[PDB]
Design a protein around this ligand. Structure first.
Ligand SMILES: C=C(/C=C\C[C@@H](O)[C@@H](O)[C@H](O)C/C=C/C=C\[C@@H](O)C[C@@H]1O[C@H](C[C@@H](O)[C@H](O)C[C@H]2O[C@H]([C@H](O)[C@H](O)CC[C@H](O)/C=C/[C@H](C)[C@@H](O)C[C@]3(O)O[C@H](C[C@@H](O)CCCCCCC[C@@]45C[C@@H](C)C[C@@](C)(O4)[C@@H](C[C@@H](C)CCCCC[C@@H](O)[C@H](O)[C@H](O)[C@@H](O)[C@H](O)[C@H]4O[C@H](C[C@H](O)[C@H](O)/C(C)=C/[C@H](O)C[C@@H](C)[C@H](O)C(=O)N/C=C/C(=O)NCCCO)[C@H](O)[C@@H](O)[C@@H]4O)O5)[C@H](O)[C@@H](O)[C@H]3O)C[C@@H](O)[C@@H]2O)[C@@H](O)[C@H](O)[C@H]1O)CC[C@H](O)[C@@H](O)[C@H](O)[C@H](C)C[C@H]1O[C@H](/C=C\[C@@H](O)[C@H](O)C[C@@H]2C[C@@H]3C[C@H](O2)[C@@H](CC[C@H]2O[C@H](CN)C[C@H]2O)O3)[C@@H](O)[C@H](O)[C@H]1O
Ligand SMILES: CCCCCCCC/C=C\CCCCCCCC(=O)OC[C@H](COP(=O)(O)OCC[N+](C)(C)C)OC(=O)CCCCCCC/C=C\CCCCCCCC
Ligand SMILES: CCCCCCCC/C=C\CCCCCCCC(=O)OC[C@H](COP(=O)(O)OCC[N+](C)(C)C)OC(=O)CCCCCCC/C=C\CCCCCCCC
Ligand SMILES: CCCCCCCC/C=C\CCCCCCCC(=O)OC[C@H](COP(=O)(O)OCC[N+](C)(C)C)OC(=O)CCCCCCC/C=C\CCCCCCCC
Ligand SMILES: CCCCCCCC/C=C\CCCCCCCC(=O)OC[C@H](COP(=O)(O)OCC[N+](C)(C)C)OC(=O)CCCCCCC/C=C\CCCCCCCC
Ligand SMILES: CCCCCCCC/C=C\CCCCCCCC(=O)OC[C@H](COP(=O)(O)OCC[N+](C)(C)C)OC(=O)CCCCCCC/C=C\CCCCCCCC
Ligand SMILES: CCCCCCCC/C=C\CCCCCCCC(=O)OC[C@H](COP(=O)(O)OCC[N+](C)(C)C)OC(=O)CCCCCCC/C=C\CCCCCCCC
Ligand SMILES: Nc1ncnc2c1ncn2[C@@H]1O[C@H](COP(=O)(O)OP(=O)(O)OP(=O)(O)O)[C@@H](O)[C@H]1O
Ligand SMILES: CC(C)CCC[C@@H](C)[C@H]1CC[C@H]2[C@@H]3CC=C4C[C@@H](O)CC[C@]4(C)[C@H]3CC[C@]12C
Ligand SMILES: CC(C)CCC[C@@H](C)[C@H]1CC[C@H]2[C@@H]3CC=C4C[C@@H](O)CC[C@]4(C)[C@H]3CC[C@]12C
Ligand SMILES: CC(C)CCC[C@@H](C)[C@H]1CC[C@H]2[C@@H]3CC=C4C[C@@H](O)CC[C@]4(C)[C@H]3CC[C@]12C
Ligand SMILES: [Mg+2]
Ligand code: NA
Ligand code: NA
Ligand code: NA
Ligand code: NA
Length: 979
């Protein structure tokens, strides 16, 4: 409740010149940037407690505790004790600590990449300083400067409206109601939230333009004070995640059951009540997989970094998964398909077609520049146009300089300045009184100006737009200079002219004008843009103007890839069905051979109505018919046609098409740029907002932001989206196989009563060696050729972890790695004197420190450490046999449909893993001192080869398993083993 003078006198500001740059910076440094502050959080404290002290590591923490107590009772009691317990504790503790460090290096990394994407797409407001308009980052606006807003932009700070032009804002986020409240410079209510002279933070200007003085800036804003609570906010969990968990739950159920079962087997066999609970605890801990979620989050984050390098920024992680399943892409033409760098080609007037483009000069012998009709046409183009040359281009040529405005007005302005002269004087010769702006719903631009004729003080009215709309507003035609009527002979010549200019892939516009009678509209009467002050019809059409705009380079290949993938492409354009049909013919939407109902009517020379609608694979629907049509007809066209093109479609219409595409049971992505589009961008599954030309509304309302505004970028993004899935399945498959060889020894040991084949140290060596680096390498795998030559996926029918993965890992591959390790075990014992038949039952006697007289097969007598040494040599051999079989498992994990001879060994990280693991096994087995500390003993040369036959069998089996898949689709192998 103040005035414009009181406001400018309180903060200090020129209503018509704004602030000065020096003063603006003085205030900018005086009170801090216009950006909210970060909220409270937990430091490394709660970050490390969850890592080193979580749920699975807790048990290891116990193992360490127990062992230390085992050493204390020893050193305190027994003279000259042993040290296997002290080193066991020193090893276990180091394992919990490392696992924690690795996990930390991953959790932080993801939390940082996400923060990087937030500054990729910052926000920039329009401020007026020293009398000039400039677009600066929202973080540089201060209190006092002048700020201008336009329908589609966001209010930067708390403004005080000083001048508005039918400006409306969406005040729904703050108080909650989306009806657009109009912002007027006058004051209306005592409550600041109800008055119209104040713009607010985070609001959006729906329609209109306005000016205002920044009253409040930074955290000193309404939503800033309210943010105390907003801080907490809310997040979510992607599908894939709730898929992995679910799995974990089932496995836990299976594990708890088996625990109780192994319990009854133990007591029916005579163990100690305590030994049965010890077994239950160990078995349930060994059946539940560990790591799944960490690898899913890391893989997703890394893939997102890969996608941002290829131009696709995602507002969240759920978009990374939905992009792969994409079935339909509803894209626009001017901005996505074409280049928006248009240029005029053919003009129509005096019932004649005229060419242009006088090579940046006055040559080319286009047409007599003297033509009267041409003077009128050149004048309306130069007058109704709203674009202007960018300041300081007095040096560059007429075609290569920079302009500000629509691409249509830019092409028009350049043609008129090259062969018609300076527009600023042409614009001052006639003074502009009232102008009405373009719009997609109107489809025309009009304005009235004074007439520079010193003998005629009347008013001139000019308007341009889609040739059909303008034709409906004319009853005369400027012909050869005079006026004539629009009868059917020239009406048909005009129709054939539209197809002539349209077939050339050029855009076409209509231009008309009319002399307003100064007797009914005097020189003093003001024609406010509210009611019908100008005769819409009865105008004088002067002539058409056409311009070219070509497609992108990579576009043809993109549509071809979509056709091979089993993806439908639809062109939704606001242009004509011809120009549409043409662009479609070029990009590849409408391939050769397919015809429409009109094509068949033309070939057969039969009425279009007689032709059978099912006979045509492709079609083109118009806007008027779409307005009239119902739901069943729409489903008919969407289901029966393969290539559908939509012309003269308004923005509000789009939602119906999207709802029809989803009714079928398909995932859709829509590209948007304006304000009317926003509703659609929310209903679809993937909202692609333009980054270059988009508005704050389109970006806030969408899931993804295209950084370059290219259609070819999308298809590449979907390729990146499918690769994530393929690699995730491969990695999980490689991790789950090692479970079988680690559990089978503890089973035969208890049931069969034989010496323990695998221990604690060796098992820890397996988990950390063959499952960490090779698994990580799998993520980096390349894409198999087939990636784009395969149908999309149905999330309901195809899941990540299904009953087939467990079939390949546990059942087929696993059992083989187990047999491979058992062979090395049997061989080591047989050679040292203990044969296989004599081994069944020796455990009871084997594990007794007191029987130094143990007798072997050849009759020798063994002490306690002499036999324990051979057992440890078996632990080391088992370990190596596991690394050897892992070689094969890893190689076969690279591809699931192609062979490795086809895919190739170009992955470097995977190779690194093979060499490094082999090195770890050789090092631990041969190093001089591991004996005392880790309990591993040297392996003789003839033993390393025991696992080789089992390693080759796995590779050959998978190779054939794949050949049968490639040859017989939908067969038994694909139904059963294709995971
Ligand atoms: C950290 C862990 C925890 C521990 C770790 C541990 O290892 C180590 O840290 C150590 O602790 C280190 C700690 C050290 C601490 C301190 C030390 O430093 C210091 C030194 O320690 C030394 C000790 C140390 O030297 C020791 O030796 C260490 C070992 O300890 C364990 C030993 O064995 C054993 O404990 C020895 C100790 C002693 O023996 C204890 C005895 C009992 C307590 C108790 O009985 C004695 C006594 O009686 O207790 C009394 C107290 C009472 O209140 C208690 C009440 C009793 C309740 C009764 C109810 C029973 C119950 C319960 C019901 C639920 C069900 C039910 C059926 O039974 C039901 C039925 C009722 C109706 C029964 C009623 C019975 C009545 C009984 C009671 O009344 C009492 O007995 C009674 O009151 C008594 O007073 C009385 O005397 C009674 O006597 C008799 C009773 C009978 O005896 C008794 O009842 C009997 C027999 C029952 C029998 O079952 C009957 C049967 C026959 C049956 O019925 C039968 O006939 N069947 C006939 C069948 C038949 O015909 N069939 C014919 C078929 C025809 O068709 C009599 O009968 C009764 O009448 C009479 O009343 O109710 C009281 O105090 C006294 O009385 C006392 O004497 C073993 C270990 O713990 C340890 O090694 C000390 O000597 C020394 O002085 C000290 O200085 C977690 C573990 C790990 O998770 C796991 O890995 C684990 O490590 C492995 C499993 C190890 C195994 O493998 C190792 C090698 C490698 C492994 O590590 C590998 O890692 C394995 C892994 C595992 C998994 C899988 C796989 O492999 C790998 C895969 C993983 C991979 O995948 C991953 C992915 N996630 C990644 C990767 O990791 O992980 C091996 O080395 C291990 O050896 C091996 O085990
Ligand atoms: C829980 C999941 C486990 C997964 C794999 C577990 C691996 C376990 C494999 C073996 C463990 C059992 C212990 C074997 C000891 C049995 C000894 C035996 O058997 O002594 C019989 C013969 C020895 O004859 P001799 O020359 O000394 O007699 C000479 C006679 N004179 C001279 C008078 C003419 O030994 C033979 O013939 C060959 C016997 C060697 C071992 C055969 C064991 C059974 C056969 C295949 C097992 C693999 C099954 C795979 C199943 C996959 C799904 C689970
Ligand atoms: C010290 C440690 C040494 C370790 C040595 C390991 C040796 C390897 C072990 C076994 C190898 C044999 C496995 C054969 C399995 C069948 C593979 C198969 O059927 O692949 C089919 C592919 C055809 O694919 P496509 O036409 O669909 O591609 C289309 C590509 N697009 C789409 C671009 C046109 O064929 C191809 O890629 C052509 C590839 C041909 C490779 C032939 C290898 C066989 C030669 C000797 C094998 C060893 C025999 C016994 C050895 C005992 C050794 C002591
Ligand atoms: C005693 C008996 C033991 C039996 C045990 C069995 C063990 C496992 C059995 C087999 C595993 C090894 C199989 C190796 C496969 C080689 C395949 C190959 O050669 O496919 C030729 C490729 C294709 O080329 P392209 O241009 O047509 O691809 C175009 C790709 N597109 C179309 C995407 C552009 O060429 C390339 O990949 C580029 C050249 C890559 C050369 C890789 C050489 C390294 C191979 C293995 C490393 C050793 C690891 C073991 C470490 C322990 C050692 C102590
Ligand atoms: C990637 C992760 C996967 C695997 C992770 C495994 C985690 C394990 C972490 C730590 C384990 C520490 C093991 C400590 C090594 C032994 C220390 C020790 O307690 O030794 C005690 C022995 C004394 O025995 P004694 O007197 O009873 O013998 C009597 C012999 N009689 C009587 C027959 C003559 O000391 C001796 O023998 C003297 C020999 C000293 C041995 C020097 C070897 C250096 C050890 C590690 C350095 C290697 C790091 C790798 C760097 C790679 C660079 C590229
Ligand atoms: C481009 C870069 C490629 C890199 C590939 C991997 C690099 C491989 C690195 C090293 C491998 C060579 C190892 C040579 C070691 C010989 C040392 C030796 O003196 O050893 C003697 C033993 C005999 O022991 P004994 O029990 O009779 O006497 C015991 C007598 N006492 C115990 C009383 C003393 O003999 C043995 O260990 C035999 C040793 C094994 C013989 C090698 C057979 C493999 C040959 C080629 C396969 C290479 C894979 C490439 C595949 C490419 C596919 C595209
Ligand atoms: C140390 C040893 C190292 C090497 C060991 C090598 C072991 C690997 C050897 C073979 C791999 C076994 C793979 C098992 C898959 C067989 C499954 C099968 O039965 O699938 C039959 C399919 C039928 O498909 P469908 O759609 O008509 O079914 C329609 C079904 N309904 C009517 C119900 C809808 O395909 C057909 O019938 C036609 C295709 C038949 C393919 C036969 C492939 C034989 C290839 C190699 C075996 C020879 C190895 C020789 C080595 C000598 C070693 C001493
Ligand atoms: N400044 C303008 N004034 C008047 N008419 C214009 C102007 N710019 C373009 N036109 C024409 O008005 C009509 C409205 O087109 P509109 O902007 O709705 O869609 P479009 O150019 O086909 O683009 P897109 O498919 O990207 O939405 C078109 O025939 C266009 O050529
Ligand atoms: C699920 C996990 C964490 C439970 C771990 C249980 C541990 C603490 C239990 C399991 C078996 C127990 C041992 C069983 C037998 C004996 C022998 C006795 O003379 C001293 C105690 C001692 C050595 C016990 C100590 C505690 C012990 C090691
Ligand atoms: C350690 C040993 C004794 C365990 C042996 C486990 C074997 C028998 C288990 C491991 C994985 C299992 C398979 C897992 C999935 C399926 C798919 C289902 O539609 C039919 C059963 C089938 C094919 C299972 C059969 C039993 C199976 C092969
Ligand atoms: C392709 C297929 C059929 C070849 C199978 C070859 C079999 C018979 C070969 C492969 C590796 C070989 C083993 C390699 C090393 C040793 C250690 C030695 O001290 C005793 C023999 C023994 C245990 C061999 C026995 C024969 C063996 C198992
Ligand atoms: Mg558009
Ligand atoms: Na693990
Ligand atoms: Na959405
Ligand atoms: Na594996
Ligand atoms: Na594992």
């Amino acid at each position: 409740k103040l005035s414009l003078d009181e406001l400018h006198n309180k903060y200090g500001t020129d209503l018509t010149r704004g602030l000065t740059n020096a003063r603006a910076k003085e205030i900018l440094a005086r009170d801090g940037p216009n950006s909210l502050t970060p909220p409270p959080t937990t430091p490394e404290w709660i970050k490390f407690c969850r890592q080193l002290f979580g749920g699975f590591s807790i048990l290891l923490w116990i193992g360490a505790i127990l062992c230390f107590l085992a050493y204390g009772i020893q050193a305190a009691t027994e003279d000259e004790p042993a040290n296997d317990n002290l080193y066991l504790g020193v090893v276990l503790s180091t394992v919990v600590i490392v696992t924690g460090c690795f996990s930390y290096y991953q959790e932080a990394k993801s939390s940082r990449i996400m923060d990087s994407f937030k500054n990729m797409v910052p926000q920039q407001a329009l401020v007026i300083r020293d009398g000039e308009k400039s677009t600066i980052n929202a973080e540089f606006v201060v209190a006092g400067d002048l700020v201008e807003v336009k329908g589609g932009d966001r209010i930067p700070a708390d403004l005080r409206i000083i001048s508005a032009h039918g400006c409306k804002v969406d005040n729904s986020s703050l108080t909650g109601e989306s009806e657009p409240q109009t912002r007027s410079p006058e004051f209306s209510s005592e409550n600041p939230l109800e008055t119209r002279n104040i713009a607010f933070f985070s609001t959006n200007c729906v329609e209109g333009t306005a000016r205002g003085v920044v009253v409040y800036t930074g955290d000193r804003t309404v939503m800033g004070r309210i943010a105390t609570l907003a801080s907490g906010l809310e997040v979510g969990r992607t599908p894939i995640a709730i898929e992995i968990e679910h799995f974990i739950h089932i496995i836990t159920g299976v594990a708890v059951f088996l625990g109780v079962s192994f319990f009854i087997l133990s007591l029916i066999l005579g163990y100690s009540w305590l030994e049965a609970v010890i077994f239950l605890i160990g078995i349930i801990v060994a059946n539940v997989p560990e790591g799944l979620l960490a690898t899913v989050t890391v893989c997703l984050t890394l893939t997102a970094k890969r996608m941002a390098r290829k131009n696709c920024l995602v507002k969240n992680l759920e978009a990374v998964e939905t992009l792969g399943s994409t079935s339909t892409i509803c894209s626009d033409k001017t901005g996505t398909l074409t280049q928006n760098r248009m240029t005029v080609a053919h003009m129509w007037f005096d019932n004649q077609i005229h060419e242009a483009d006088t090579t940046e000069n006055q040559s080319g012998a286009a047409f007599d520049k003297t033509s009267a009709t041409w003077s009128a046409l050149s004048r309306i183009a130069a007058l109704c146009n709203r674009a202007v040359f960018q300041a300081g281009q007095d040096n560059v040529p007429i075609l290569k300089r920079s302009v500000a405005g629509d691409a249509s007005e830019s092409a028009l302005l350049k043609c008129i300045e090259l062969c018609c002269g300076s527009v600023q004087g042409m614009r001052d010769r006639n003074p502009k009184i009232v102008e009405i702006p373009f719009n997609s719903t109107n489809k025309y631009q009009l304005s009235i100006h004074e007439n520079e004729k010193s003998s005629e003080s009347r008013y001139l009215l000019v308007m341009k737009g889609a040739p059909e709309r303008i034709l409906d507003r004319c009853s005369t035609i400027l012909l050869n200079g005079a006026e004539e009527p629009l009868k059917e002979d020239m009406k048909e010549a005009f129709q054939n002219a539209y197809l002539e200019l349209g077939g050339l892939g050029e855009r076409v516009l209509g231009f008309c004008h009319f002399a307003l009678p100064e007797d009914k509209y005097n020189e003093g009467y003001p024609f406010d843009a509210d009611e019908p002050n100008f005769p819409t019809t009865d105008l004088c059409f002067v002539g058409l103007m056409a311009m070219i705009d070509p497609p992108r380079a990579a576009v043809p290949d993109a549509v071809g890839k979509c056709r091979s993938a089993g993806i439908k492409v639809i062109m939704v354009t606001g242009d004509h069905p011809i120009t549409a049909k043409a662009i479609a013919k070029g990009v590849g939407i409408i391939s050769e051979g397919n015809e429409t109902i009109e094509d068949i009517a033309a070939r057969l020379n039969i009425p279009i109505g007689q032709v059978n609608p099912r006979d045509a694979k492709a079609c083109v629907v118009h806007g008027s018919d779409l307005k009239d049509l119902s739901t069943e007809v729409l489903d008919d066209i969407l289901h029966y046609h393969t290539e559908i093109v939509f012309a003269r479609t308004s923005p509000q219409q789009k939602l119906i098409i999207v709802e029809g595409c989803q009714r079928q049971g398909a995932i859709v992505a829509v590209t948007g740029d304006g304000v009317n589009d926003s509703p659609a961008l929310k209903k679809a599954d993937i909202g692609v907002a333009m980054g270059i030309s988009g508005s704050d509304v389109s970006k806030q309302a969408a899931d993804m932001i295209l950084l370059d505004d290219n259609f070819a970028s999308i298809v590449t993004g979907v390729e990146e989206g499918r690769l994530i899935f393929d690699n995730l399945k491969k990695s999980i498959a490689y991790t789950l196989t090692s479970n079988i060889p680690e559990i089978t020894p503890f089973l035969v040991f208890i049931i069969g009563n034989v010496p323990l084949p695998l221990g604690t140290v060796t098992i820890l060596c397996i988990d950390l060696g063959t499952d960490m680096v090779p698994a990580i390498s799998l993520a980096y795998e390349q894409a198999e050729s087939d990636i784009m030559k395969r149908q999309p996926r149905n999330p309901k029918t195809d899941k990540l972890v299904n009953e087939r993965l467990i079939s390949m890992a546990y059942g087929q591959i696993g059992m083989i790695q187990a047999l491979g390790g058992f062979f090395s075990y049997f061989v080591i014992l047989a050679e040292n004197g203990f044969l296989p038949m004599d081994l069944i039952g020796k455990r009871v006697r084997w594990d007794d420190r007191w029987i130094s007289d143990v007798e072997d097969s050849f009759g020798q007598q063994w002490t306690y450490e002499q036999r324990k040494i051979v057992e440890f040599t078996c632990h080391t051999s088992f370990f190596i046999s596991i690394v050897v079989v892992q070689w094969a498992d890893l190689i076969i994990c690279k591809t699931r449909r192609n062979s490795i001879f086809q895919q190739g060994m170009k992955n470097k990280i995977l190779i690194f893993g093979l060499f490094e693991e082999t090195a770890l096994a050789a090092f631990l087995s041969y190093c001089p001192g591991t004996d005392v500390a880790l309990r591993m003993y040297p392996l003789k040369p003839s033993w390393w080869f025991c696992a080789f036959p089992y390693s080759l069998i796995i590779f050959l089996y998978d190779e054939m398993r794949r050949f049968i898949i490639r040859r017989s689709p939908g067969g038994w192998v694909e139904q059963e083993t294709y995971y």
